[PDB]
Structures are given as structure tokens and as C-alpha cells.
Amino acid sequence: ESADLRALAKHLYDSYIKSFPLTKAKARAILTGTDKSPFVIYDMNSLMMGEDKIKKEVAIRIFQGCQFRSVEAVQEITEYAKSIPGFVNLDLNDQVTLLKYGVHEIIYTMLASLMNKDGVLISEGQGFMTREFLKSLRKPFGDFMEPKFEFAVKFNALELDDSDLAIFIAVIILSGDRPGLLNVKPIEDIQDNLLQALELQLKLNHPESSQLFAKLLQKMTDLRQIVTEHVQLLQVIKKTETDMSLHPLLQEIYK
Ligand SMILES: CCCCC/C=C/C/C=C\C/C=C\C/C=C\CCCC(=O)O
Numbered sequence: 001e002s003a004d005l006r007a008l009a010k011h012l013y014d015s016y017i018k019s020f021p022l023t024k025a026k027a028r029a030i031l032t033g034t035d036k037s038p039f040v041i042y043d044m045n046s047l048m049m050g051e052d053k054i055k056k057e058v059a060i061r062i063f064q065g066c067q068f069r070s071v072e073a074v075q076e077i078t079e080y081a082k083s084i085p086g087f088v089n090l091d092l093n094d095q096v097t098l099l100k101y102g103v104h105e106i107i108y109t110m111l112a113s114l115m116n117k118d119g120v121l122i123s124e125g126q127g128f129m130t131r132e133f134l135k136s137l138r139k140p141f142g143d144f145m146e147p148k149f150e151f152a153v154k155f156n157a158l159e160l161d162d163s164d165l166a167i168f169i170a171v172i173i174l175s176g177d178r179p180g181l182l183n184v185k186p187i188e189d190i191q192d193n194l195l196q197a198l199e200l201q202l203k204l205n206h207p208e209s210s211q212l213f214a215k216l217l218q219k220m221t222d223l224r225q226i227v228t229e230h231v232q233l234l235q236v237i238k239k240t241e242t243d244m245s246l247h248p249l250l251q252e253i254y255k
Pocket residue numbers: 022065066067069070111120121122123124125129234250
């Protein structure tokens with residue numbers, strides 16, 4: 001019955017709002033247009049005054065900032081996952097496995113909410129780092145964000161809102177096809193119900209948007225592609241920068 005799917009969609013949106021302090025709705029209000037104006041970093045000097053206004057060479061300081069943020073995001077995504085009905089009843093090992101593989105796919109999904117074609121919000125939306133400035137960073141740091149911007153521009157053309165994204169990131173987490181899953185079936189049973197919830201949500205929220213459900217699911221391919229490209233870039237850094245710390249929580253995820 002659709003009444004149960006709407007209850008599920010409302011539950012997850014409620015938990016999404018409780019778990020993720022910077023929503024897409026707030027991100028868009030900041031990015032578009034007096035109290036919410038970000039400071040804008042587009043070079044080293046603006047970065048210099050930015051570190052003052054908002055708050056080791058430039059590329060590395062930016063890189064570890066990303067690390068700290070990703071860790072914070074993992075923590076938010078973990079909190080959100082525990083609210084997905086059934087998730088915490090799964091085998092403990094499968095819970096770790098689902099988070100291990102799902103966490104970066106969600107990060108890039110939600111990172112798009114903070115992006116437009118020209119740059120990305122930072123520091124809880126207080127700042128805005130331009131795409132060009134990041135693309136101009138020393139090799140191989142200048143290659144990190146561009147694939148993410150490329151995805152975001154197309155993903156954002158779907159015009160999903162937070163209530164759509166709450167169900168969609170839940171679908172990503174409950175993927176029965178992650179390597180090493182000990183009991184696939186209860187995961188798939190949760191995802192099927194999440195998939196039913198998503199389907200009804202997009203049909204009601206986007207009545208004119210034909211086959212949005214199918215297009216959103218095909219986007220899960222771009223997400224996988226971004227991860228593997230990102231993993232390769234990290235292995236270059238581990239050898240180029242033997243003095244540079246990578247956070248152990250992220251180390252364990254990438255293992
Ligand atoms: C919205 C809250 C404020 C965030 C402040 C952002 C600081 C860094 C700026 C841009 C990048 C944003 C997120 C990190 C993305 C990928 C992390 C790569 C490290 C890894 O996982 O291997």
C-alpha cells in the first residue's frame with residue numbers, strides 16, 4: 001500500500017534533516033541569492049584572507065581540509081544509516097561492509113548539492129571555493145575535484161530535492177551486491193521496499209519528469225566510476241607525499 005511507502009519516505013526525510021546539517025535547500029539558497037553570502041576563494045590571497053574571514057603548501061592544506069570534511073561526512077552518513085529501518089538489525093559485519101562501500105558514493109551524491117558549474121560551498125556554506133582555483137592546484141591535487149564537478153552538473157540537472165535524496169541515499173547503502181556480504185537476502189528485501197518508496201516519491205514529487213526513477217538509478221554508474229578514479233589518485237599521493245597524513249578512518253574504508 002502507498003500509505004506505508006509515504007510513511008517510510010517521511011521517516012527518512014525527517015532523519016536526513018536531523019543527520020545532515022547542510023541540506024541541498026540551504027545550499028541552493030546560499031548559492032543563488034543578504035545574510036547567507038559566502039566568502040569566495042579563487043586564489044592564494046583570497047585563500048589567505050579566507051582562512052582569516054571564515055575558519056604546509058596550499059595544495060596540501062586544501063587536501064587535508066577535504067580529509068577532515070570527508071571524515072565528518074562519514075560520521076553524518078553513519079548516523080543516518082542507523083535510522084534506515086532494518087539496517088541496525090542486520091549482521092554486524094554486513095553493516096560495516098555496507099558503510100565501507102556506500103559511504104563515498106553518498107558523499108559525491110550529496111557533494112553535488114553544494115556544487116554549481118563554477119565552484120563548491122565549504123565550511124558549512126560560509127565559503128565558496130571556485131572550480132578553477134581547485135583545477136589549478138599542483139599535480140596531482142588539481143585533478144581531484146573535476147570529475148566530481150562533472151558528475152554534479154549532470155546529476156543536479158535532475159533537480160532532486162532533499163526529500164528525494166533521503167530515499168535515494170538509503171537505496172545506495174542497502175546494496176546487496178557489495179563484495180563480502182554475508183547475508184545478501186535481508187539487504188535486498190530492505191532495498192526493494194526502499195526502491196518502492198523512491199519510485200512513489202519521484203512520481204508524486206515530479207509528476208512531469210518522465211522516467212526520473214530510471215535515470216536516477218542509472219546515475220549509480222557514474223558514482224562507482226568516480227570512486228575508482230579517486231582511489232587511483234590517492235595511491236599516487238601516498239607515494240609522492242610520504243610525509244602527508246591520511247586519516248585512519250578513511251584508510252580503513254579504502255582498504
Ligand atoms: C559542508 C560542510 C563544510 C565543508 C568544508 C570543505 C572543505 C574542503 C573543500 C572541498 C571538498 C569537500 C569534501 C571532500 C571531498 C572529497 C574528499 C577526498 C578525501 C577522501 O575521502 O579520500
